[PDB]
Amino acid sequence: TRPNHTIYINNLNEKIKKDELKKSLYAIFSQFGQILDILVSRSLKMRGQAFVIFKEVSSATNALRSMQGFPFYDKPMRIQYAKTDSDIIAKMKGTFVEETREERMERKRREKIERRQQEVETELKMWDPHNDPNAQGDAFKTLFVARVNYDTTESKLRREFEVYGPIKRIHMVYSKRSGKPRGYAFIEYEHERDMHSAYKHADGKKIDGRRVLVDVERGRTVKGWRPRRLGGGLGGTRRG
RNA sequence: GGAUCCAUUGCACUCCGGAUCCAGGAGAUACCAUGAUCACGAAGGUGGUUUUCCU
Ligand SMILES: [Mg+2]
Ligand SMILES: [Mg+2]
Ligand SMILES: [Mg+2]
């Protein structure tokens, strides 16, 4: 009830968004004087209310007198003086008395990646196909067949690839865990020539409904080869 | 942000009521698809799913 630099306005329409409300209060209330600020919140405690801070108390007093009851967004404005000085008034007077989520996130990706690289590095030095009991015979006579139907039998496969020449050995690969087939095999020919021939002619060959992929064995032939699980591999189905 | 419902007439100046759902944004997803080319396996990315923020 005692005059003040700041006026308090309530009974405001609660549907109106914050900037709109600040805007429309500025338009209406500058007519009475210089405004330092209009404070609005739409929180539970503060919605329906505004503090208009004027430079002079006299503007405040005239703004209060004139606008009392004024129709504003289909609602009469209720205006009083603020009970207490607004911080910027009080400081003007010397009356005044009192990892982000973006960082935690970025750090976490960074560590997973690094953690991953170390894992791969460690596996890598466990990896040696020349010392694997599964990898036998002449690498240079060995074909690599992937994308096989899980249903395809070792027979059907030996049949399809025998056309290119006598086969010394087939090793289809199974999960050491489930024992489910991995969809790939090594086929060692008697003669390098016949492997080369399967290589030229069998790629894309349809066996049990699925186009198979045919390549040479690279594990034991290609300088610097790493398999897909060690960050290498060929093919591009899942590049992005 | 927005839609519906509910609560609120509140004196602040450190965001910030509830519910259910929607759009965009940014996270996260253990699960599904992509049946990933090297002897059981990438990670992830992309598309789902679920979920947490922001508007
Ligand atoms: Mg090695
Ligand atoms: Mg998968
Ligand atoms: Mg994946």
Numbering used by the authors: 6 to 103, 126 to 267
Verbatim from the authors:
60–216 of U1-70k via Gly–Ser linker. stem-loop I and U1-70k in detail, illustrating a new mode of RRM-RNA interaction. (A) Interaction of stem-loop I with U1-70k RRM. (A) C33 and G34 embraced by U1-70k loop 3. and A32 stack onto Phe106 and Phe148 residues of the beta sheet. loop is closed by a trans WC/Hoogsteen base pair formed between A29 and A36. strand the bases A35, A36, G37 and G38 continuously stack. along with A29 and Arg190, continues the helical stacking of the stem. (B) Interaction of stem-loop II with U1-A RRM. detailed RNA-protein contacts between U1-A RRM and stem-loop II.
